[PDB]
Amino acid sequence: GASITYNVSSTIKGVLTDDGVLTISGTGAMPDYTKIANIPWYKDRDRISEVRVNSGITSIGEANFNSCYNMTKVTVASTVTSIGDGAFADTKLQSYTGMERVKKFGDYVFQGTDLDDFEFPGATTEIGNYIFYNSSVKRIVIPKSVTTIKDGIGYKAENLEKIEVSSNNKNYVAENYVLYNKNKTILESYPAAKTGTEFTIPSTVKTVTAYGFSYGKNLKKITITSGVTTLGDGAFYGMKALDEIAIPKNVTSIGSFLLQNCTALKTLNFYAKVKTVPYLLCSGCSNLTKVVMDNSAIETLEPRVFMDCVKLSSVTLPTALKTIQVYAFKNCKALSTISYPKSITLIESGAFEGSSITKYPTWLSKGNNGDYGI
């Protein structure tokens, strides 16, 4: 019978037996791998169906079982206190036993996994970023021990229906399976497969975490209440059913690609007190027909804000706008006419490339470098 031995470190070894089990034995911290092709068992990924990390090992390193596509189970001993970035990224992970003393989880640890019901183990204190990216996870359970959950726990966890938090958790809470911080001032994550056509952000919320409502399957409408001041990067990214939204005046901080690829979005009312309309705002909003931007604070349209908005025909620019940057209205085929506010100072070369906008302001002149300025 073939039995393969892997040199992991001076105190750690790996043994892959004929039964498809990769057993990590020895003592200490497993190494961090910066390249997937550097993992010792890279050439034997087809043979690994289960991983066992035995007593003596104190941590699973970065990308250790990354791309072990046939791995459906991991057994983690009580001596392991941390699991590194993408440790099980793109495994067929379905369940685990152990992890009794794991305190820290890195980023993308369970990316592309085949999970259903997942409960974080009893000693978990820190959960890294985008931990379930493309995971099939349907339910996440947060124990009382968790003190830190980084941005995007549900980001591209497209089958996620529920997030449940222990009543005894001191930093987080779940209300109707929606994840919040304990005092509900931050809306952390809305499960993408959670049922419901309408949602009102609680009045107590000041911040919507980056990717909070990303890939949302069912919401047609979101009410951004008066308390919200911050909208994170892609907070409404690629929502399937969102048909309209109003960004109110109270919002003073907006991330990039906020409503990017919301293919059901028909209308945008943007009233946020911000100096710029952020990069990729409504890029790929293929059904967006009307946009109203109204705030005396808005000075700039960053690039690609309405790129490939092929149905966008009416655009109301903010009355004190000064700059339209490259590709802001790239391929806006339906945008035939626009009213320019007298405050415009610069239209960068290519702002209206692919659009049906032919004329530019009278007070602007084409620079010897393609830009329209003074």
Tab-separated table of C-alpha atoms in Angstrom:
chain	number	residue	atom	x	y	z
A	1	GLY	CA	0.000	0.000	0.000
A	2	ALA	CA	1.156	3.470	-0.945
A	3	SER	CA	1.756	5.756	1.996
A	4	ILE	CA	3.168	9.233	1.317
A	5	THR	CA	5.153	11.254	3.857
A	6	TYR	CA	5.418	15.055	3.674
A	7	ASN	CA	8.085	17.164	5.278
A	8	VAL	CA	6.116	19.995	6.839
A	9	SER	CA	8.683	21.378	9.343
A	10	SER	CA	11.411	20.102	11.696
A	11	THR	CA	8.654	19.186	14.214
A	12	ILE	CA	5.673	18.483	11.899
A	13	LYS	CA	4.956	15.784	9.296
A	14	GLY	CA	2.075	14.785	7.066
A	15	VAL	CA	1.133	11.195	6.137
A	16	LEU	CA	-1.387	10.451	3.348
A	17	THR	CA	-2.587	6.835	3.565
A	18	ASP	CA	-4.382	4.662	0.895
A	19	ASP	CA	-7.742	5.377	2.660
A	20	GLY	CA	-7.447	9.073	1.568
A	21	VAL	CA	-6.616	10.407	5.030
A	22	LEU	CA	-3.976	13.141	5.383
A	23	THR	CA	-2.778	13.089	9.022
A	24	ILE	CA	-0.773	16.033	10.355
A	25	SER	CA	1.318	15.007	13.374
A	26	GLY	CA	4.036	16.597	15.490
A	27	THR	CA	4.277	19.813	17.528
A	28	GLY	CA	3.867	23.549	17.015
A	29	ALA	CA	2.686	25.973	14.382
A	30	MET	CA	2.086	24.723	10.836
A	31	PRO	CA	3.824	26.925	8.179
A	32	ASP	CA	2.066	29.593	6.135
A	33	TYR	CA	2.016	28.991	2.384
A	34	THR	CA	1.898	32.103	0.163
A	35	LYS	CA	1.479	30.076	-3.067
A	36	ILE	CA	-1.040	27.172	-3.385
A	37	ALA	CA	1.604	25.238	-5.426
A	38	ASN	CA	4.022	25.381	-2.394
A	39	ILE	CA	1.790	23.223	-0.107
A	40	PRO	CA	3.602	19.852	0.323
A	41	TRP	CA	0.620	17.712	-0.817
A	42	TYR	CA	-0.182	20.020	-3.867
A	43	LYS	CA	0.485	17.204	-6.372
A	44	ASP	CA	-1.729	14.748	-4.303
A	45	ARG	CA	-4.885	16.884	-3.804
A	46	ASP	CA	-7.004	14.290	-5.729
A	47	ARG	CA	-6.190	11.661	-3.055
A	48	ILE	CA	-7.115	13.690	0.072
A	49	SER	CA	-10.715	13.047	1.237
A	50	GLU	CA	-10.180	13.805	4.949
A	51	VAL	CA	-7.649	15.771	7.044
A	52	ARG	CA	-6.751	14.994	10.677
A	53	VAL	CA	-4.682	17.581	12.644
A	54	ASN	CA	-3.459	15.709	15.772
A	55	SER	CA	-2.578	16.769	19.371
A	56	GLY	CA	0.633	18.783	19.561
A	57	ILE	CA	-0.134	21.052	16.567
A	58	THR	CA	-0.918	24.593	17.821
A	59	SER	CA	-2.074	26.252	14.570
A	60	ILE	CA	-3.155	25.491	10.956
A	61	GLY	CA	-1.289	27.866	8.664
A	62	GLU	CA	-2.210	29.967	5.679
A	63	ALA	CA	-3.615	27.990	2.661
A	64	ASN	CA	-2.614	24.616	4.251
A	65	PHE	CA	-5.502	22.617	2.682
A	66	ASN	CA	-6.285	25.152	-0.046
A	67	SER	CA	-7.650	23.485	-3.243
A	68	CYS	CA	-7.910	20.031	-1.601
A	69	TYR	CA	-11.090	19.692	-3.649
A	70	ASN	CA	-11.925	16.127	-2.562
A	71	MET	CA	-11.629	16.943	1.270
A	72	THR	CA	-15.091	16.679	2.880
A	73	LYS	CA	-14.059	16.483	6.585
A	74	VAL	CA	-11.420	17.884	8.961
A	75	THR	CA	-10.627	16.736	12.511
A	76	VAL	CA	-8.872	19.447	14.560
A	77	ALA	CA	-7.293	18.620	17.952
A	78	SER	CA	-7.727	20.748	21.143
A	79	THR	CA	-4.084	21.984	20.915
A	80	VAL	CA	-4.934	24.074	17.743
A	81	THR	CA	-5.706	27.697	18.715
A	82	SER	CA	-5.718	29.361	15.252
A	83	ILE	CA	-6.621	28.508	11.602
A	84	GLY	CA	-4.880	30.678	8.987
A	85	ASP	CA	-6.125	32.518	5.876
A	86	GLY	CA	-7.784	30.250	3.276
A	87	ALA	CA	-6.805	27.089	5.235
A	88	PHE	CA	-9.819	25.233	3.728
A	89	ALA	CA	-10.383	27.484	0.664
A	90	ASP	CA	-11.854	25.499	-2.221
A	91	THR	CA	-12.143	22.206	-0.291
A	92	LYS	CA	-15.417	20.157	-0.367
A	93	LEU	CA	-15.623	20.728	3.443
A	94	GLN	CA	-18.976	19.474	4.721
A	95	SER	CA	-18.323	18.996	8.455
A	96	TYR	CA	-15.695	19.144	11.161
A	97	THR	CA	-15.047	17.491	14.510
A	98	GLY	CA	-12.976	19.200	17.230
A	99	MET	CA	-11.680	22.816	16.948
A	100	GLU	CA	-12.460	22.985	20.722
A	101	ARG	CA	-9.757	25.585	21.433
A	102	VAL	CA	-9.601	27.501	18.068
A	103	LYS	CA	-9.717	31.210	19.004
A	104	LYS	CA	-8.772	32.879	15.658
A	105	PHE	CA	-10.008	32.217	12.091
A	106	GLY	CA	-8.326	33.993	9.184
A	107	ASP	CA	-9.793	35.357	5.973
A	108	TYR	CA	-11.486	33.098	3.342
A	109	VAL	CA	-10.931	30.052	5.642
A	110	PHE	CA	-14.150	28.384	4.343
A	111	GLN	CA	-14.203	29.901	0.840
A	112	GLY	CA	-15.807	27.553	-1.746
A	113	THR	CA	-16.708	24.918	0.880
A	114	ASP	CA	-19.677	22.502	0.724
A	115	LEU	CA	-21.127	23.471	4.145
A	116	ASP	CA	-24.806	23.381	5.193
A	117	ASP	CA	-25.280	24.081	8.923
A	118	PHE	CA	-22.117	25.627	10.407
A	119	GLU	CA	-21.551	26.481	14.047
A	120	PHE	CA	-18.365	28.284	15.066
A	121	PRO	CA	-16.581	26.294	17.827
A	122	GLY	CA	-16.877	27.237	21.541
A	123	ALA	CA	-13.605	29.181	21.997
A	124	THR	CA	-13.853	31.336	18.774
A	125	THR	CA	-13.054	35.004	19.467
A	126	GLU	CA	-12.057	36.331	15.997
A	127	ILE	CA	-13.680	35.572	12.569
A	128	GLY	CA	-11.746	36.886	9.543
A	129	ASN	CA	-12.972	38.589	6.330
A	130	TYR	CA	-15.059	36.950	3.533
A	131	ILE	CA	-14.820	33.654	5.474
A	132	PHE	CA	-17.675	31.940	3.488
A	133	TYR	CA	-17.005	33.358	-0.030
A	134	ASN	CA	-18.731	30.934	-2.530
A	135	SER	CA	-19.446	28.507	0.362
A	136	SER	CA	-22.764	26.665	0.114
A	137	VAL	CA	-23.378	27.416	3.899
A	138	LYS	CA	-27.142	27.758	4.687
A	139	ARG	CA	-26.850	28.622	8.414
A	140	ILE	CA	-24.121	30.272	10.547
A	141	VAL	CA	-24.258	30.014	14.373
A	142	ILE	CA	-22.147	32.544	16.422
A	143	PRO	CA	-21.293	31.331	19.993
A	144	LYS	CA	-21.109	33.631	23.091
A	145	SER	CA	-17.244	33.724	22.884
A	146	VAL	CA	-16.981	35.695	19.548
A	147	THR	CA	-15.762	39.285	20.129
A	148	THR	CA	-14.677	40.179	16.540
A	149	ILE	CA	-16.364	39.470	13.150
A	150	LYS	CA	-14.526	41.150	10.253
A	151	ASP	CA	-16.280	42.535	7.099
A	152	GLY	CA	-18.347	40.245	4.877
A	153	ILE	CA	-19.151	37.069	6.901
A	154	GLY	CA	-21.988	36.398	4.383
A	155	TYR	CA	-20.224	37.891	1.312
A	156	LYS	CA	-21.097	35.630	-1.705
A	157	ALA	CA	-22.540	32.987	0.697
A	158	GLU	CA	-25.467	32.890	-1.803
A	159	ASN	CA	-27.347	30.014	-0.061
A	160	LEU	CA	-27.134	31.645	3.434
A	161	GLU	CA	-30.612	31.834	4.975
A	162	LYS	CA	-29.847	32.301	8.678
A	163	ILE	CA	-27.310	33.925	10.989
A	164	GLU	CA	-27.954	33.077	14.654
A	165	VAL	CA	-26.061	34.622	17.613
A	166	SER	CA	-25.978	33.375	21.239
A	167	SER	CA	-28.013	35.625	23.589
A	168	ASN	CA	-24.887	35.649	25.857
A	169	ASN	CA	-22.584	37.089	23.118
A	170	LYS	CA	-21.341	40.491	24.359
A	171	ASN	CA	-20.522	42.061	20.929
A	172	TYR	CA	-23.070	40.702	18.404
A	173	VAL	CA	-26.798	39.942	18.081
A	174	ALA	CA	-29.109	38.555	15.370
A	175	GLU	CA	-32.594	40.011	14.754
A	176	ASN	CA	-34.761	37.942	12.338
A	177	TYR	CA	-31.591	36.044	11.265
A	178	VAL	CA	-29.872	39.409	10.287
A	179	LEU	CA	-26.436	39.951	11.944
A	180	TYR	CA	-25.822	43.161	13.988
A	181	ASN	CA	-23.392	44.370	16.641
A	182	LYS	CA	-24.842	43.958	20.241
A	183	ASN	CA	-26.285	47.561	20.281
A	184	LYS	CA	-27.681	47.268	16.659
A	185	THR	CA	-25.709	50.410	15.516
A	186	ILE	CA	-23.981	48.335	12.768
A	187	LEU	CA	-25.897	46.124	10.290
A	188	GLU	CA	-23.235	43.485	9.727
A	189	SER	CA	-24.807	40.981	7.283
A	190	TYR	CA	-28.195	40.173	5.688
A	191	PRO	CA	-28.340	36.447	4.566
A	192	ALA	CA	-28.524	36.387	0.701
A	193	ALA	CA	-31.192	33.607	0.631
A	194	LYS	CA	-33.269	35.127	3.535
A	195	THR	CA	-36.992	35.369	2.606
A	196	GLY	CA	-38.715	38.774	2.285
A	197	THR	CA	-39.438	41.394	-0.435
A	198	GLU	CA	-38.982	44.533	1.752
A	199	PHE	CA	-36.597	45.544	4.574
A	200	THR	CA	-36.371	48.635	6.766
A	201	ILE	CA	-32.899	49.245	8.258
A	202	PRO	CA	-33.474	49.795	12.051
A	203	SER	CA	-33.373	53.501	13.103
A	204	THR	CA	-30.618	52.534	15.614
A	205	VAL	CA	-28.169	51.628	12.744
A	206	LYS	CA	-25.412	54.172	11.864
A	207	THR	CA	-23.379	51.860	9.572
A	208	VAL	CA	-24.115	49.180	6.947
A	209	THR	CA	-20.977	46.985	6.804
A	210	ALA	CA	-19.309	46.456	3.380
A	211	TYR	CA	-21.170	43.767	1.378
A	212	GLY	CA	-24.023	43.598	4.033
A	213	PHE	CA	-26.822	43.042	1.446
A	214	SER	CA	-24.581	41.771	-1.407
A	215	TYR	CA	-26.028	39.027	-3.775
A	216	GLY	CA	-29.432	39.415	-2.033
A	217	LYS	CA	-31.916	37.210	-3.865
A	218	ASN	CA	-35.328	38.425	-2.599
A	219	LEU	CA	-35.425	42.095	-1.420
A	220	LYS	CA	-37.178	44.435	-3.884
A	221	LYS	CA	-36.903	47.451	-1.528
A	222	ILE	CA	-34.581	48.692	1.292
A	223	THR	CA	-35.468	51.692	3.470
A	224	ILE	CA	-32.304	53.520	4.614
A	225	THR	CA	-33.476	55.158	7.859
A	226	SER	CA	-32.285	58.621	9.171
A	227	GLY	CA	-29.549	57.150	11.434
A	228	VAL	CA	-27.395	55.623	8.663
A	229	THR	CA	-24.244	57.750	7.984
A	230	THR	CA	-21.974	55.011	6.504
A	231	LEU	CA	-22.550	52.594	3.594
A	232	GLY	CA	-19.637	50.188	3.138
A	233	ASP	CA	-18.033	48.956	-0.123
A	234	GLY	CA	-20.568	47.001	-2.184
A	235	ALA	CA	-23.178	47.103	0.638
A	236	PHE	CA	-25.842	46.434	-2.057
A	237	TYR	CA	-23.555	44.703	-4.565
A	238	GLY	CA	-25.297	42.519	-7.178
A	239	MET	CA	-28.745	42.351	-5.520
A	240	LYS	CA	-30.988	40.228	-7.747
A	241	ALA	CA	-34.450	41.691	-6.855
A	242	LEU	CA	-33.721	45.333	-5.744
A	243	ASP	CA	-35.873	47.497	-8.132
A	244	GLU	CA	-35.350	50.977	-6.544
A	245	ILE	CA	-33.396	52.710	-3.775
A	246	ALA	CA	-33.034	56.105	-2.142
A	247	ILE	CA	-29.675	57.120	-0.627
A	248	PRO	CA	-30.800	59.762	1.930
A	249	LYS	CA	-29.079	63.064	2.998
A	250	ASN	CA	-27.960	61.514	6.362
A	251	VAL	CA	-25.461	59.256	4.500
A	252	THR	CA	-22.024	61.017	4.578
A	253	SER	CA	-19.706	58.055	3.735
A	254	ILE	CA	-20.142	55.639	0.788
A	255	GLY	CA	-17.825	52.887	-0.385
A	256	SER	CA	-16.994	51.753	-3.916
A	257	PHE	CA	-19.198	49.561	-6.264
A	258	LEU	CA	-22.176	50.189	-3.810
A	259	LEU	CA	-24.970	49.046	-6.193
A	260	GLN	CA	-22.798	47.430	-8.876
A	261	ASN	CA	-24.547	44.808	-11.039
A	262	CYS	CA	-28.045	45.307	-9.475
A	263	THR	CA	-29.657	44.122	-12.743
A	264	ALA	CA	-33.260	44.581	-11.425
A	265	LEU	CA	-32.644	48.263	-10.267
A	266	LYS	CA	-34.848	50.636	-12.235
A	267	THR	CA	-34.439	53.924	-10.311
A	268	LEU	CA	-31.839	55.630	-8.077
A	269	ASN	CA	-32.528	58.684	-5.848
A	270	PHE	CA	-29.155	59.829	-4.488
A	271	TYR	CA	-29.309	62.606	-1.837
A	272	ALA	CA	-26.213	61.703	0.252
A	273	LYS	CA	-24.137	64.577	1.744
A	274	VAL	CA	-20.853	63.416	0.075
A	275	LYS	CA	-18.237	65.363	-1.999
A	276	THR	CA	-18.011	62.510	-4.641
A	277	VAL	CA	-20.311	59.874	-6.209
A	278	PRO	CA	-18.046	56.841	-5.555
A	279	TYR	CA	-16.320	54.665	-8.169
A	280	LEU	CA	-18.421	51.903	-9.859
A	281	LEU	CA	-21.628	53.057	-7.911
A	282	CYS	CA	-24.159	51.663	-10.470
A	283	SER	CA	-21.819	49.919	-12.920
A	284	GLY	CA	-23.736	47.216	-14.790
A	285	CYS	CA	-27.157	48.364	-13.643
A	286	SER	CA	-28.565	47.239	-17.031
A	287	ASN	CA	-32.184	48.102	-16.158
A	288	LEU	CA	-31.500	51.489	-14.496
A	289	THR	CA	-33.629	54.024	-16.411
A	290	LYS	CA	-33.717	57.118	-14.106
A	291	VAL	CA	-31.118	58.676	-11.776
A	292	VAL	CA	-31.663	61.731	-9.557
A	293	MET	CA	-28.587	63.169	-7.797
A	294	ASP	CA	-29.457	66.026	-5.473
A	295	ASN	CA	-27.068	67.466	-2.864
A	296	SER	CA	-25.198	70.800	-2.861
A	297	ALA	CA	-22.136	68.895	-1.460
A	298	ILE	CA	-21.551	66.671	-4.533
A	299	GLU	CA	-18.538	67.967	-6.581
A	300	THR	CA	-17.336	64.819	-8.410
A	301	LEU	CA	-18.594	61.862	-10.433
A	302	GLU	CA	-15.847	59.237	-9.995
A	303	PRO	CA	-15.096	56.869	-12.947
A	304	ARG	CA	-17.597	54.162	-14.050
A	305	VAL	CA	-20.427	55.401	-11.720
A	306	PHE	CA	-23.064	54.562	-14.434
A	307	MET	CA	-20.900	52.424	-16.719
A	308	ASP	CA	-22.879	49.974	-18.949
A	309	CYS	CA	-26.208	51.447	-17.746
A	310	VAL	CA	-27.575	50.840	-21.262
A	311	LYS	CA	-31.249	51.702	-20.234
A	312	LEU	CA	-30.334	54.959	-18.364
A	313	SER	CA	-32.187	57.778	-20.193
A	314	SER	CA	-32.795	60.502	-17.517
A	315	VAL	CA	-29.909	61.736	-15.349
A	316	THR	CA	-30.349	64.688	-12.980
A	317	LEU	CA	-26.883	66.003	-12.082
A	318	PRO	CA	-26.320	67.712	-8.650
A	319	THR	CA	-26.671	71.544	-8.926
A	320	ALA	CA	-23.073	72.210	-7.601
A	321	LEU	CA	-21.272	69.411	-9.588
A	322	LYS	CA	-17.749	70.376	-10.809
A	323	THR	CA	-16.220	67.166	-12.258
A	324	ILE	CA	-17.337	64.238	-14.441
A	325	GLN	CA	-14.438	61.685	-14.631
A	326	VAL	CA	-13.549	59.088	-17.356
A	327	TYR	CA	-16.245	56.443	-18.108
A	328	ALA	CA	-18.825	57.924	-15.653
A	329	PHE	CA	-21.466	57.331	-18.408
A	330	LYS	CA	-19.520	54.688	-20.423
A	331	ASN	CA	-21.872	52.899	-22.908
A	332	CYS	CA	-25.009	54.779	-21.725
A	333	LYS	CA	-26.676	54.115	-25.132
A	334	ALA	CA	-30.133	55.428	-23.895
A	335	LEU	CA	-28.661	58.645	-22.453
A	336	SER	CA	-29.439	61.059	-25.321
A	337	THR	CA	-29.920	64.308	-23.350
A	338	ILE	CA	-28.555	65.823	-20.098
A	339	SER	CA	-28.786	69.202	-18.351
A	340	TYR	CA	-25.325	70.495	-17.354
A	341	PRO	CA	-25.118	72.557	-14.115
A	342	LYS	CA	-23.341	75.923	-14.688
A	343	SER	CA	-20.854	74.841	-11.934
A	344	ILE	CA	-19.118	72.183	-14.165
A	345	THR	CA	-15.358	72.869	-14.454
A	346	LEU	CA	-14.044	69.595	-16.017
A	347	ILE	CA	-15.345	66.688	-18.122
A	348	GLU	CA	-12.526	64.130	-18.422
A	349	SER	CA	-11.864	62.559	-21.875
A	350	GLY	CA	-14.139	59.499	-22.204
A	351	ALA	CA	-16.750	60.488	-19.552
A	352	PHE	CA	-19.497	59.975	-22.192
A	353	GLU	CA	-17.787	57.321	-24.374
A	354	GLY	CA	-20.312	54.926	-25.903
A	355	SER	CA	-23.255	57.109	-24.812
A	356	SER	CA	-25.669	59.102	-27.021
A	357	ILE	CA	-24.408	62.414	-25.508
A	358	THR	CA	-22.885	64.372	-28.420
A	359	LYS	CA	-22.796	68.006	-27.083
A	360	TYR	CA	-20.803	69.212	-24.022
A	361	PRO	CA	-21.100	72.607	-22.108
A	362	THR	CA	-20.540	75.847	-24.051
A	363	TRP	CA	-18.177	77.203	-21.306
A	364	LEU	CA	-15.824	74.163	-21.685
A	365	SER	CA	-13.189	73.686	-24.432
A	366	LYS	CA	-11.434	70.516	-25.695
A	367	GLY	CA	-7.895	70.469	-24.310
A	368	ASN	CA	-4.862	69.510	-26.424
A	369	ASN	CA	-5.007	66.283	-24.280
A	370	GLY	CA	-8.766	65.369	-24.896
A	371	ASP	CA	-10.256	66.639	-21.601
A	372	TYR	CA	-12.933	69.391	-21.616
A	373	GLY	CA	-12.034	72.234	-19.228
A	374	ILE	CA	-11.255	75.948	-18.964
